[PDB]
Structure formats: structure tokens, C-alpha cells
Symmetry: D2
Subunit: 295 residues, 4 copies
């Protein structure tokens, strides 16, 4: 037998950083969870018990905290590039670094219609993520994403015209609830290295905001023919609004809310056009996925 | 042996209700999870296999959906009172109904600075809850609450002056992070019945908003001596702003963020007044609880 | 306003202890999560910012580890009594200690039909818990429990004869699946203090084993008329097998598995006596509770 | 823009099946959660609102239940092959089916040392999974796996000899705790189709049992130089014991248990060779991965 692939490192590293502007008195906090896995010439640690090739996972943990001490942590696309470059440049036998970051929301509080200078709230379990693959001689690949954006529209969604056969019982509808947890990922053109990543820094926060904006606007306004159709439209617009993206990927659960027929009780009318009370279903759920790129 | 206490019913009943205003075109959604447990003369179902005393849990589920069909679901303090009264009035052998409701956030979306008429977002896993105990011959007890309000302030919290002995290693501090998940419960004066609950309806939403407001304002502004001291202040104000509350109860985790000493690496300065990078701790956590009422 | 009730301390303290028998070479591990909350004369910390009354939560954490260093951690009913007594005896202003322990399973591995001396497996997320309330001048109250015992029987459960009215749609059945997560709690007679708790030590592990045994045996063998009826029988037997218990309490979800009617597809027969394929329901769920004590 | 990749279907389909042997009276239950995603000529549903290409997710759900009605559900490698083949054979425009199954443990109860004929227990949250990719003109790829096998050994693990530099603070050790959640995946040689999958049926359950056996035996007995070294050994043996596997893949968290130095309290000795009491760490965690195949 032989090692065909190996990676190792440190996962679930929780990291908080504060920035204190001494002139203005205002403080800004950043919280994230980091995973760094390394590849390179490490097979002998698996096959021969040779630990001389191991940058200890503990040491990778120490490095994350140092790196966040010495550099900005925002945008995450930059922090990740810096962190991954560090490992491949610092260690000759390590040839790739894989960095994953989840950014947790700490939004500034409004207290009598005024931004408080050092108090924050988790206004949503929605995350901003990055996946950074820094590979020696191959540059820096970044996939940015948002996930856990949970939305629901109470009308202007339809699902009619779908295949029917001896497995089909679903009725066509011209009016239903649509609800989903939005997972949107946009993959950047390969960057030559850290210098190039630095050069595009302002695009990162801006493109995130755009993807979020486009997603919610299109979800809200599209008279959705299908989850398929509505996600295509989102993906299309993100590509059209930022040249440096090669692909946009959506993964959308269809979180079903079922009609409850209450006519068996005193002829109570709660279906079709009388539908007020619904049963949200925890499972199963439709899962719809689409990767869109450039013609 | 003998049955000293028994209750039974249906838990985790997910319920969605839509309200469609046909004049304005605007739709409002309400989502909640309901638990109804009943007590009364039911011991024989346990001891004799006599099911004639069981209002089936399935039937309790059916009743929740019907009741939400026939009445408002908001405020939850009312829906719960209606639902619990139903069971004790409808069934002679059932003498108490316990209703618990968790309200999930579906906030209306802003789409180009304008409230969209039928699109919504889960902007926080924060819940609004009620606990309604409708007891035959004893009226209606309501405990309202908010939970899962996650906050953090990066300075203006201190913890100094605490007992020190041979078990103590914690250092006094005049500047630390304070972060918590706020659980605040306010218990209403016993209501005589449903008529009385209806009479106070406008107080329910208003007092919820107040508790939330007071909590975030005081968390933000208090130069906190301790979590103890800061929660007392919140509780005090909620009582002072609403006469119908008998007690206010806070339960606050202290979610510790530890300093990371990086001086072992190139004399890097990250402690005391140089503290920028912190390690959020997942466990253990301080847990602080206080019930405040009227002198 | 005034403090009517207060408690504080440290929650989620993960604790591992190893015992190494040097003669036999065999090692035994114990893992648990501990919560200690204290009450006493502590109101001034809430109302006056007086921290001199606070045994720091950090220090309570340190104390748990020390106490586990200096005493057995098993049975948990003893460890908890020792830990709670410590705080009320050590500190004059602290008058109650509340100790909660969850014991995690680390079962010894069989490796070629022989107990390995130092390797272990988590064979079930089932927990053994205690709740110990050590109150100055009032002795030591212990509630022991097991929770997360997940079971299912594919036949010999019935539910017929229950109230029917205009809210009822559930059909009577003489053959159904019954599945539950068993939560069983047994409350000991108040102990005078630690000496008394020590005196009964062998009863703790033995009574736990009994409750577990009785639960699974009765769940398996009873031709259950109802969840109510089956739980009563368990509770009865636990009381009858141990004199020092005053009450036994069961809390049982009814985790419904629904028949799937497939006759709409090629007359496929999957209901009643032809029922092979079922849909496990994640929610809602019946919740059934009973406290049994002595005539 | 253009669709580069698309898949859709139904996720989280909970499925229970009972087998009743009428001669012996004995009943056997199988529970699983299924995901089926389809690919093929479906782009027009995304780009043109053409739903005529959609086998409704609801219908895929119906199909899973039917298929489990008409065929065995065990081994999962077979059920998945049957289910995926169904979709590509039944529908001309659908060219791949991706089937994922998680099998939940329902182990038969021992009641007075005898297998009860219809009562079961969830003895571990450990899962058996499959990933089946049935692709038109490309046969059937199966990845089998076990996950959530949580183990711990209290000694006979070491970690010494690893790179040290200005990022390193971890001390070498010749005696530590090792604990992990084992994720082991073994990938079968591509099968020509369902006939071929049927031909190897007995290998599936047998190879699962082997992987489990090898894992626990090697975890227990290896005097582990590193998690790397210990996992390599497991993977090696699985390949050596079954010719039809092309690769074995392990993913192992290192779930750290930290020494607690208690010498600051009365010179208490709890480090090195005196280590009895440890702090299990919830995060961060080392994550170690290795794919092994044939020379
Ligand atoms: O087994 C281990 N492998 C590693 O790579 C490592 N790094 N720190 N600790 C470790 N333990
Ligand atoms: O209300 C429902 N809508 C559906 O589409 C469906 N499919 N199975 N059951 C259902 N109930
Ligand atoms: O065992 C049961 N007890 C109940 O009270 C009930 N209600 N519906 N189904 C039920 N099953
Ligand atoms: O940074 C820390 N602060 C604390 O209060 C503490 N207590 N134990 N370890 C600790 N680390
Ligand atoms: O606010 C706090 N209250 C406390 O009781 C405590 N104990 N350690 N740290 C603390 N912080
Ligand atoms: O199969 C079912 N059994 C039930 O008891 C039930 N109640 N609502 N729907 C149901 N489906
Ligand atoms: O938007 C939808 N897309 C689908 O593919 C589907 N299948 N059933 N319901 C559905 N809704
Ligand atoms: O006990 C510890 N062991 C370790 O390896 C380590 N690394 N950081 N802190 C630590 N504590
Ligand atoms: Na390198
Ligand atoms: Na009544
Ligand atoms: Na005392
Ligand atoms: Na096909």
C-alpha cells in the first residue's frame, strides 16, 4: 500500500480580534473560526513514524493567532491568503495550505438611533466564509461564500408543468410558500500570489455585499417558476456584476410548508385560496444545486 | 405505589400562519413551535390501562392548528391563553393546560429601502417565548421571555474585588470583554381568565419590546462591575416600567474570551493594554441567575 | 425592587479522571460535565456592586478539578455530595450548593473477546446524571437519572379506547411501533449529610443498573396499552426494588412512525397488516410524564 | 452565462422498514436517511423555466419508499445501487443518480441473556454510510463508510520528534491520551452495473465489519507514534483484507485532553506521571487525513 493523498492540521480554531481607534474612541471586533490543513512531503509521518516532517497542529494553532496579531483579519479572503502563503514559504517540505474561515456576525448596536462605540449583537446565524487554497507554484484559489441566510416568501412562487407518471402525486400549484437557507459560493479567478490578492482587496467585501443583495432582491421579486429558475437568476447577476468571478454556485433547500386540510372539522376551510394555517416540515427537503459560469 | 403527578400532550408542533390584507396587498407571516400538556383526572390511563380519559396527543395537535385557524396567533400570550382555556373548558376531567410557545423571527425584507409586501428573513435565532398555565379555578399564569439574544461588548466591563483564597487564581481586571446569551423572563400578575388576558393585550408586545430595549441599552451603557450587577439593573428597569409584572428573572452565561500571551514568540505584546487577539472559549462558562421582584 | 432569588457559578466544566491500577496494569477512565451553582448571602453583588461576596466562577472551576483530584468521582451521587458540602462548609455566607453532573459513557473495548486494559468506546449517547442539592441545615437531596436511552419495539404496542370527538382523527390500533428516548429520574430520601451519603454508596450504582434494567425489560415485554401504562409499570418496579427512593419520574416522548399508504401506485399494499415501510416523524411528538411515589 | 453543473433531488428522507419472519416470530427493523440527487439534461429548468424536465423532488421521495417496499434495504450498497439505477433507466434525460444513505443503529435487545424478537436499542450514534454514484454508461461507484465511532485510549500514545521552531510551544510526550471520532471510507472498484453489484453482496457487510474490527483493534493495540502513523496501519490492513477496495481513507480528529497543573494549590501533583485529572478540550482540534491505495 501507499499514501495517495494526505493532509493535516488544526480545525475549529476560534479567533477574536479587536481594533481600537484611539482618536475616535470606537472599537471594532472580528470573530471567526479557522481551519488550516497542510500538504507536502509528509508521507513518512504516516508510513515510517517519521514526525520530523510534522509542523505540529498545536504550532499551526499558535501561527493563526500570531498571524491575526500581525495582519488584518479582514477581508477573510486576504487573511486566508496571508496565512496559507506563510506555511508554504516558511516550510520547504510543505507545498499546499488549505485555509477555511467562517466569519461570525458581530453587528454594532443602535442605542437611541446612534452607533454605540463598543457594543455588538449577533443579528443572524448567517456566516461569511472563505476557502483559500495556496499551492506552491500554482498561486491562490479563493472560493468566497455566504451560508445560513434563511428566507421565506409567502406568495409569488409556483411550481407547475413538471413530469407526471406513476411515481407522481404532487399537485401543480400557482401559489405556494417558498423558504430556503441560502448557500451561495463564488469562485475567483486564480490569483498569482499574495501581491495579486492584495491588489483586489476592495473587491472582496464589495462582491460579498453584492451577492447578498442580489440574492435577497431576486428571491423577493422573482415570481419563481421553480427554485431552479430563481437560483439561476441570482447566479447570472453575480457573474454579470463582477468580472473576476469564474463561477457562481447556489445550493438551496426547499423547506416545505404543507397545507393543512381542516374540512373534516366543521367544514373548516384552510386549503387552496383559504390557506392560512400551514405545517412547516422539518424533513424531508428538496435540495437544488446549480453551478453557473461564463458562456 | 401511586401517581403523584402526571401530565401529557403534544410537543414540537410547528405552526405557520399567514395574514393577507387584500386592500393593501401586504402579507404578514407568524411562525412558532407549540407544546401543550394537560393535567386532570387522568391517573387511570397510567394505572388501569383506561384510555377513555385520554384526549389523544394527535387530537391536541389537530386542536392547535384549528385554534390558530380561528383566532389570532399574536401576541403569543393571548394565543396560549385561548388554547389552554379551550382544553379545560372543553373537557370536564382536564383541569390544567400548560402551553409553551417559541416564536421564530420572520422579519420583513427591505428591498431598495422599502418594506416588501410578502418576503421575509430570519434575522437572528433570538426567540420570543411564553409559558401559559391555565388552571381550572386558578386563572391564567403567564411567563413571557426572550432568549438567545447574543451580545458582546469589547470594553467597559470589570471584575475586581472578589473573594481570594487558596482556590483562587483569577486576576482582577478593570478591562475585559463581556459576552452573553440573554435569557430574560418576566412573570405577569395572575389573570382571572381569558377576558382579563384580552383586556391587557396591548401590554404584551409593548412589554416584550421594553425588556429587549432595556436589556440592550443597559448591557451597552453600564460600566459593568460584574454580570450580577449589570443584570440587576436590567431587571430593576423592567419592573419599574410595567406594573403588571411581579418578577423579572435573568439567566446570563459569561462567555469567556481569554487573553493569548504571545510574548514567547519574538516578544510579541498581546496582553493587558496590548490585547488585540483573544481565544473565545466554548466551555466552561460562568452562569449567573437573579430573580428580582417588588420591595 | 429586591432580589428574591439568586444563584451563580460555573457550568459546562468538562472533567476527565484516570485510575491506574499498577499491580494489574489496567486503567479505568471517568468522564463527566459538571455544573455548580451557589446560593447564600450574595445579594449585595447584584444590588451594590459588592464583589467581596463572590467566590469567583473561575475558582469554582478550579475547585471541581481539585476535588476530583482528591476524591473519587464515582459514584456521581457521592462526588456531587462532596463537592456541594465543600462550598457550604468552606464559605460561611454560602448556604446552598447545587451540583449537576452528566456522566459520559466510556466503555472498555473487547479485543478478541478480552477486556483491553486502557482502550474505550462511547457505546451510546445515553447519560447517567445526578442533581445534588446540599443546603446548610437541610442535608443533601439527590435526584439520580438516566437519559437518552433510545429504544424501539416494532410490535406489541396498542393504542385503542381513547376519547373521540370533533377534534379527533387518530384511528385506534392494536398494532403499532413504539419508540422513545427514556428519561427516568429517581429521587432519594433526604440524607442528613455526607456521612449518610457515604453509608449508602453501594446503593447508587446498583439502583442505577436496576432502573436501566427495569426500563428495558418492561419496555420490551409489556404489551403496551399506552405509553402512560407502560411507564407506570417501570416506575412501580423501581420503587418496589429500592426503599430509599421516595419518587420515580418518567418523561417519555412518543416518536411516531407513520404508515405510508402506497396503494395509489399499482395497488401497492403497505398499510395495516401489510405495513413494512414507515416514515419516521421528526416532529411533532407526544410527550408523556408521570411521577409515581409510595401509597 | 451558462449552467456548468446542476443536480437536484430530495434530501433527509427518513425511512424505516420492518421484516417479520412468520415462522420464527422474530422481527428485524432497518432505519436510514436517504438523499437522491439527479443529473442529466435538466439545464432548461434553470434557464428557461422549463419544468417538463423535472422529476419532482416529491416524486423522488415517493420512489424511495416504493423501492424500499419492493427490494431489500440491506446491505445499503445494494439498496443505493437499485435506487440509482432506477432513475437513470426509468428516465431518458436523467443520466446520473447520486444516492447517499446513513444507516442508524437499531440493535436487538438482550433481555435475561436472550435476543428479544421485536425490541431494539440505539447503542451508539455511530453510523454506517454509503455514497452510490450510478452514471449512465459509466457503471456504479460505491464509497462505503463508518463515522461517529468515538474512542479513547488512556495511555500508549506518544507524540515526540516533530519540527520545532519559533512557532512551536508543544512539549514532546511519551505518554498521552488519544481520543478521536473515526471516519473511515473505503472505495470499491467501479462495478459494471447492478448485476455486478448483486454478485458481490456478501462482501459489503463483511468488509464493513472488517473495517470496524481493524479500526478498533489497531487503535487499541498500536503504541501510536502519531495519529498519522496509527491511521496508516488501519488503512493498510483494510486494503490487504479485501481485493475489491481501491482506496481506504481515514479522517481523524485529535480530541485533546489537557493536563491540569494543580501545584499552585498546596503543591498538588497532577502533571506528568502524576496526571489523573484532565480537561477535555471541545476546540480546537487537530484534524488528520490520509488516503491510502495500492502500490
Ligand atoms: O498525533 C498527532 N499528530 C500531529 O500532527 C500533532 N500535532 N500536534 N499534536 C499532534 N498529534
Ligand atoms: O401538503 C402537502 N404538499 C405536498 O406537496 C406533499 N407531498 N406529500 N405530502 C404532501 N403534503
Ligand atoms: O401511547 C399513547 N398515549 C397517548 O396519550 C396518545 N395520544 N395519541 N397517541 C398516543 N399514544
Ligand atoms: O485568560 C484567562 N483568563 C482567565 O480568567 C482564566 N482562568 N483560567 N484560565 C484563564 N485564562
Ligand atoms: O461577572 C462575573 N461574575 C462572576 O461571578 C465571576 N466569577 N469569575 N468571573 C466572573 N465574572
Ligand atoms: O400515519 C399517521 N398516523 C397518525 O396517527 C397520524 N396523525 N396525523 N397524521 C397521521 N398519520
Ligand atoms: O421548486 C421546486 N423544484 C423542484 O424540483 C421540485 N420538486 N418538487 N417540488 C419542487 N419545487
Ligand atoms: O496541556 C496542554 N497541552 C498542549 O499541548 C497545549 N497546547 N496549548 N495549550 C496546551 N495545554
Ligand atoms: Na514550501
Ligand atoms: Na375542565
Ligand atoms: Na456556609
Ligand atoms: Na437515463
Amino acid at each position: 500500500s501507499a499514501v495517495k493523498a494526505a493532509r493535516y492540521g488544526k480545525d475549529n480554531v476560534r479567533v477574536y480580534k479587536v481594533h481600537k481607534d484611539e482618536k475616535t474612541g470606537v472599537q471594532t471586533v472580528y470573530e471567526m473560526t479557522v481551519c488550516v490543513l497542510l500538504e507536502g512531503e509528509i508521507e513518512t509521518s504516516y508510513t515510517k513514524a517519521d514526525n520530523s516532517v510534522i509542523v505540529a497542529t498545536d504550532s499551526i494553532k499558535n501561527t493563526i493567532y500570531i498571524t491575526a496579531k500581525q495582519n488584518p483579519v479582514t477581508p477573510p479572503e486576504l487573511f486566508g491568503s496571508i496565512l496559507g502563503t506563510h506555511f508554504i514559504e516558511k516550510y520547504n517540505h510543505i507545498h499546499a495550505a488549505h485555509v477555511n474561515i467562517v466569519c461570525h456576525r458581530w453587528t454594532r448596536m443602535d442605542i437611541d438611533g446612534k452607533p454605540h462605540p463598543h457594543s455588538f449583537i449577533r443579528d443572524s446565524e448567517e456566516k461569511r466564509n472563505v476557502q483559500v487554497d495556496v499551492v506552491e507554484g500554482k498561486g491562490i484559489d479563493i472560493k468566497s461564500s455566504l451560508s445560513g441566510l434563511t428566507v421565506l416568501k409567502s406568495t409569488n412562487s409556483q411550481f407547475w408543468g413538471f413530469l407526471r407518471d406513476e411515481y407522481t402525486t404532487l399537485k401543480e400549484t400557482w401559489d405556494r410558500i417558498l423558504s430556503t437557507d441560502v448557500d451561495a459560493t463564488w469562485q475567483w479567478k486564480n490569483f498569482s500570489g499574495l501581491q495579486e490578492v492584495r491588489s483586489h482587496v476592495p473587491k472582496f467585501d464589495a462582491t460579498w455585499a453584492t451577492a447578498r443583495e442580489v440574492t435577497l432582491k431576486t428571491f423577493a421579486e422573482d415570481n419563481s417558476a421553480s427554485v431552479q429558475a430563481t437560483m439561476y437568476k441570482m447566479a447570472e447577476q453575480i457573474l454579470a456584476r463582477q468580472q473576476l468571478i469564474e463561477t457562481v454556485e447556489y445550493s438551496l433547500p426547499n423547506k416545505h410548508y404543507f397545507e393543512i386540510d381542516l374540512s373534516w372539522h366543521k367544514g373548516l376551510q384552510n386549503t387552496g385560496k383559504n390557506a392560512e394555517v400551514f405545517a412547516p416540515q422539518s424533513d424531508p427537503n428538496g435540495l437544488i444545486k446549480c453551478t453557473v459560469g461564463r458562456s
